Ligand binder design. Structure first.
Ligand SMILES: C[S@@+](CC[C@H](N)C(=O)[O-])C[C@H]1O[C@@H](n2cnc3c(N)ncnc32)[C@H](O)[C@@H]1O
Lengths: 49, 1024, 50
């Protein structure tokens, strides 16, 4: 009766969805972007730009 | 109560005498425009936590700050702000003194409106010069405003005999203000325009204007002594934010400020200080036909009416207000319970009480109406507050004459129960060990090995381990091994041996030590080695060399002490290792380890010396072996027992090893050992009943604590339910000590009743049928804030006094001598007779004292009797009869009161006991038994004049001796049999001290023994 | 060093299941505990209102 899935699945609270950012994929995208922000911010890799 | 939150009126006060005010002078204008150190137009307000200036208060020389502070541009620090204000007032000062000379205008008037708008237009840089020549006023005050010089609607506009002005910025916020509740409130007085004022001549013309003007937000008046002529207040829709739960608008903020100012004035009225305004409140005029019932403005109007009447609050207000206390006040005023006063606000007129102390209706004429039909049953005088203490304080109850059921008390205490909380435990036993010693006497007696009593066979119980762990965990020490070793050396170096005339041992004996634990948080050895080598014990001779042995040493070697390992022989060895750790929980292996360890200790003694043994588990084999083996081959011996832990171990000391001697055990050692095992059994039975160390109490055990929590609204006569609850806790507690606390619990003032239950209290509570009830007045008088403390199991810390110890002794022997179903008589019952707590629940009393007591008369199961008749007299025992006489401490008290000797007092008392019907009796006499010792600080002696003079009580009485007592007793009764009781050396009494939850401080019980041998009692039957 | 590197919390709060990036606590223990004090003070006032 049970089904396996790679990602956490919280059910819908409401039947009228609307955008918020409180999930794992947005957190993933934000931390990846944060590391590339650090990667461009480091003074050893490029000040050259 | 309680209008909506409770107020403590009980009387009502008001400021009677009044300062008539002076008016403007231009000399004063220059004086207070010059910002002197002594006086200046501002005044700072500070925090109550950091005392940092977060707000300022300004007054009369400036009010025209109605524009925006972005347009003004003040700095953020108070010092820079005040010097900035100083220099700007200096520039405008020079300008206005250019345009007006002081000599001609020495004493001419001004428009305060023109002054405030002038300094505001100068600070806002808004072309003040057209406003400038309208400064000095004409014949009247307002006609210069009506016929305008230049119409300046940014400051004031005319409306045909009605002047509109925009009064703003009574206060000014500094940037470090951050809406903290400890910061002072602002009441929305720092915004751009919180309200609008309508100055004009007459209220009729103003109400003809209000026919057409809006009155949606309500209108406020002052009616007493207005600032610049008769006017109104029109608040706007700006709201106050600084209260975090509540959001109130401008009009409620102004009315709340004014009503709290009147509440402040009603307390400070002392009939000698005249104030600047007779009353403060505003009295909403036209909004009552707009807004309705159960609105906040209406409720504050009710409170302002009561404040103008002159009521006073319940809680003492602070001198400097806080947002925390203000929001608590608003939460109290929007609560519940609409009204109890007969007063209601009106729009036609204002109303004051028929018995109000205010005289403002006769002071000023218009608006204030005296009412005749409404009357108040309250008082006239002032009210004062009590001084709070941070410590919890004791309380003592007083009993009334009414009674209800103990089941009703049980129901009320079940309603008010706050039992399940963990208390702080404390310590049952502080001080030091006790000297329990006996020496061998040669010519004393002779006994055999089989006669000795032993450990009880119920030794390895879980309940016995529970009790001994409870005792050893509750007891408080430094190092127990330090205490034991100091005691055993101080008893070891006392007497002399029969061979040498000098003493036992000398200095420099080159001793050895067995069984060193070596863990004592530093100095990795037992803690007696260094002070005993230095001679710090001051009763010992110092040794020469010390060796420590045992399998836990740090400096010596680790050796199995049971199997004989030979080493260097020393003149003195000291065993300290048990047979429990090396044993395997068996009496047989314990006895065998005693065998082997004592054998090795005998064979390693360097003969002619001595040793000390400790024995945890002695058996038939142990005693029989040492009597058949060691006692022949020893010169003398010693067995002592210092006591810090509840255990069966003793300390056996030998003397003069390896010399043959016909030497056995004696009956004095037998009595010592019988009494040792007996006191072990009694104290184990005591420790078995007490609850554990880290428990939570819930009122289930017979001993323990109890607290309840009620709240008291004002000085109201509180309900019968809480009265039954408090009196039921009194019947549960049984006249013991109790402490209370008064503090605002989370928005409400609470009451705590903290005390402790006992089985003697249980038998007292079972003795009486109905519980009596108490006086609520002694609780309803208090208005101070008694800060609470954590619940502790033990109130006493330093230990019980020896007088408490002798009282416990006496209570114990009276409770042991009394039986169930018996009439008694207590001579000198004291304030509260403990004989109610001693006897069984079914036996009556016939008790009497010269002291008038407050015991609950009536509502008993078995009857009681309380009266006063000057008991050292006759004729009354012919009226009331008894069976056994208990006269504790009243003999010396009556003898010191009547200045008469014990011989005359005792012969009179035994005469009126020949009048009695009692067959047995026991009275407190004061007889020396031993040679008197003049105990330091408690009991000194007197040979000739024959007194004692207790210095602690400050009391003094003679003493009579036992042969003269025998002479009087046999002259009275030729048939009597007297038995002097021995001193309670077996500690049977200790249960009545422990179950009342009080530590003892064993120096006090040593002094108690040394004192109890100087006033004992006896038991006399009339037959024998 | 006896320097505070971890905290232990209990019964009045357990619902910290979301991400500490969404929460935003400071790095020093003193600033963290006064931050927790003032946020509990605000929620304290809210729940005592209601
Ligand atoms: C109660 S302690 C004495 C503590 C010591 N008075 C002190 O100052 O710390 C008994 C000590 O003797 C040791 N012990 C017990 N049985 C022993 C045995 N058969 N041989 C040698 N040492 C033993 C234990 O290791 C324990 O440290």
């Amino acid at each position: 009766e049970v089904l396996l899935l790679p990602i956490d699945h919280q059910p819908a609270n409401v039947t009228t969805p609307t955008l918020d950012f409180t999930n794992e994929l947005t957190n993933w995208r934000a931390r990846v972007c944060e590391l590339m922000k650090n990667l461009v911010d480091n003074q050893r890799y490029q000040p050259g730009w | 109560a309680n209008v909506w939150g409770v107020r403590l009126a009980d009387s009502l006060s008001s400021p009677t005498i009044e300062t008539r005010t002076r008016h403007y002078t231009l000399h004063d204008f220059y004086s207070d425009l010059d910002a002197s150190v002594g006086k200046e137009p501002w005044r700072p307000l500070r925090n109550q936590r950091t005392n940092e200036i977060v707000a300022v208060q300004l007054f009369r020389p400036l009010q025209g700050l109605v524009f925006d502070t972005q347009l003004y541009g003040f700095p953020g620090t108070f010092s820079q702000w005040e010097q900035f204000m100083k220099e700007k007032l200096r520039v405008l000062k020079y300008e206005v003194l250019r345009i007006y000379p002081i000599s001609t205008y020495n004493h001419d008037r001004v428009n305060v409106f023109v002054a405030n708008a002038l300094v505001g237009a100068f600070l806002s840089n808004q072309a003040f010069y057209d406003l400038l020549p309208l400064l000095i006023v004409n014949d009247t005050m307002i006609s210069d405003l009506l016929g305008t010089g230049a119409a300046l609607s940014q400051f004031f506009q005319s409306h045909g005999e009605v002047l509109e002005v925009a009064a703003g910025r009574k206060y000014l916020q500094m940037n470090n203000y951050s809406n903290d509740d400890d910061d002072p409130p602002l009441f929305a007085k720092d915004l751009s325009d919180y309200a609008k004022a309508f100055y004009s001549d007459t209220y009729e013309v103003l109400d003809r204007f209000f026919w057409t003007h809006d009155s949606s937000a309500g209108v406020l008046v002052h009616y007493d002594k207005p600032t610049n002529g008769n006017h109104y207040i029109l608040g706007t829709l700006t709201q106050m934010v600084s209260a975090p739960p509540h959001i109130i608008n401008a009009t409620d903020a102004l009315l709340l400020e004014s009503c709290l100012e009147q509440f402040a004035a009603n307390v400070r009225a002392r009939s000698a200080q005249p104030v600047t305004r007779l009353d403060q409140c505003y009295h909403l005029r036209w909004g009552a036909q707009y807004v309705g019932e159960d609105s906040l403005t209406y409720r504050l109007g009710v409170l302002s009416l009561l404040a103008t009447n002159g009521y006073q609050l319940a809680r003492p207000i602070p001198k400097q207000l806080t947002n925390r206390w203000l929001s608590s006040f608003v939460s109290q005023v929007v609560s519940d319970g609409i009204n109890e006063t007969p007063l209601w606000p009106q729009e036609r007129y204002v109303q004051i009480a028929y018995d109000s102390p205010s005289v403002v209706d006769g002071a000023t004429q218009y608006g204030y109406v005296r009412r005749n039909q409404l009357r108040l049953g309250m008082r006239i005088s002032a009210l004062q507050s009590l001084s709070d203490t941070p410590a919890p304080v004791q309380w003592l109850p007083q009993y009334t004459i009414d009674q209800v059921a103990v089941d009703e008390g049980d129901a009320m205490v079940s309603q008010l129960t706050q039992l399940p909380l963990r208390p702080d435990y404390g310590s049952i036993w502080i001080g030091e060990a006790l000297s329990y010693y006996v020496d061998y006497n040669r010519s004393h007696r002779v006994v055999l090995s089989s006669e000795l009593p032993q450990l009880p066979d119920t030794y390895f119980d879980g309940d016995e381990q529970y009790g001994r762990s409870l005792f050893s965990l509750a007891r408080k020490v430094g190092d127990r091994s330090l205490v034991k070793d100091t005691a055993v050396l101080k008893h070891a170096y006392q007497a002399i041996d029969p061979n040498t005339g000098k003493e036992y041992l000398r200095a420099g004996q080159s001793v050895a030590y067995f069984g060193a634990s070596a863990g004592h948080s530093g100095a990795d050895q037992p803690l007696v080695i260094e002070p005993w080598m230095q001679g710090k014990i001051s009763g010992v001779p110092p040794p020469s060399s010390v060796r420590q042995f045992g399998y836990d040493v740090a400096k010596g070697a680790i050796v199995d002490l049971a199997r004989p390992f030979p080493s260097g022989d020393y003149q003195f060895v000291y065993s300290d290792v048990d047979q429990v750790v090396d044993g395997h929980d068996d009496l047989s292996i314990s006895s065998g380890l005693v065998e082997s360890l004592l054998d090795s200790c005998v064979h390693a003694t360097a003969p002619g010396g001595s040793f000390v043994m400790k024995i945890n588990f002695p058996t038939r084999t142990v005693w029989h072996y040492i009597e058949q083996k060691i006692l022949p081959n020893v010169t003398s011996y010693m067995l002592i027992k210092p006591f810090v832990t509840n255990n069966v171990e003793v300390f056996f000391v030998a003397f003069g090893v390896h010399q043959q001697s016909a030497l056995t055990w004696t009956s004095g050692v037998y009595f010592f050992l019988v009494d040792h095992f007996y006191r072990y059994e009694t104290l184990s039975a005591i420790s078995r009943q007490l609850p554990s160390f880290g428990y939570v109490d819930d009122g289930s055990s017979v001993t323990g604590i109890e607290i309840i929590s009620i709240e008291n609204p004002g000085f109201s006569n509180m309900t019968q339910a809480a009265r039954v609850g408090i009196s039921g806790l009194c019947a549960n507690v049984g006249n013991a000590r109790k402490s209370i606390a008064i503090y605002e619990s989370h928005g409400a003032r609470v009451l705590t009743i903290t005390s402790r239950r006992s089985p003697a209290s249980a038998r007292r509570k079972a003795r009486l049928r109905y519980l009596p009830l108490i006086d609520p007045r002694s609780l309803e008088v208090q208005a101070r804030t008694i800060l609470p403390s954590n619940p502790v199991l033990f109130d006493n810390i330093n230990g019980a006094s020896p007088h408490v110890c002798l009282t416990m002794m006496y209570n114990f022997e009276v409770s042991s001598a009394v039986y169930d179903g018996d009439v008694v008589l207590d001579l000198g019952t004291g304030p509260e007779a403990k004989i109610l707590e001693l006897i069984p629940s079914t036996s009556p009393v016939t008790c009497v004292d010269i002291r008038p007591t407050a015991q609950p008369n009536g509502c008993w199961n078995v009857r009681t009797t309380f009266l006063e008749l000057d008991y050292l007299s006759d004729g009354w025992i012919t009226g009331v009869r008894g069976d056994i006489v208990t006269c504790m401490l009243s003999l010396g008290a009556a003898a010191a009161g009547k200045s008469m000797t014990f011989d005359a007092a005792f012969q009179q008392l035994v005469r009126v006991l020949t009048r009695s019907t009692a067959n047995v009796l026991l009275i407190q006499v004061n007889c020396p038994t031993d040679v008197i010792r003049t105990i330091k600080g408690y009991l000194e002696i007197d040979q000739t004049n024959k007194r004692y003079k207790f210095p602690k009580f400050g009391r003094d009485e003679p003493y009579s001796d036992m042969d003269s007592l025998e002479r009087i007793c046999r002259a009275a009764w030729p048939n009597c049999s007297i038995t002097w009781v021995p001193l309670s050396y077996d500690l049977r009494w200790t249960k009545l001290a422990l179950l009342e939850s009080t530590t003892l401080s064993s120096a006090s019980v040593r002094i108690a023994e040394l004192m109890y041998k100087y006033m004992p009692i006896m038991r006399i039957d009339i037959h024998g």
